[PDB]
Chain A
Amino acid sequence: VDVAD
């Protein structure tokens, strides 16, 4: 899944 840096 896509997450924030």
Chain B
Amino acid sequence: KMRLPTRSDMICGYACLKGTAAMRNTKRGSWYIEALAQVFSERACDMHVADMLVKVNALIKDREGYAPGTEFHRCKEMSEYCSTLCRHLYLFPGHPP
């Protein structure tokens, strides 16, 4: 009979890269969460989760810090995800209707 590895079928989205800070707007919240919600709500209907995290990556790469007079002014951040997924992960929202 087929057995499993100790761990599989996980996907982990990180707000930033190893060694670095993730950025948060004191009013609007975290860049990564803001991007994640905008993409998932827009594209979960027709895009798998790993591909949506790629769209999140695109949004984070483009953003820059607004924090005049401080070391965060114009700073950058890059998100990433690590995957042990073994199939497309579609959330099929609102199906069946």
> A residues within 8 Å of B by Cβ?
1-5
Contacts and interface: CB of A to CB of B under 8 A. Distances in A.
Count class of interface residues, chain B = 10 to 19
A2 B21 contact: no
Contacts of A4: 21-24, 72
Instruction: Specify the main secondary structure of chain A where it touches its partner.
Output: strand
B67 interface: yes
Interface of B: 15-16, 21-26, 30-31, 65-68, 70, 72, 75
A3 B67 contact: yes
B25 A5 contact: no
Contact of A1 (B15, B25, B30): B25
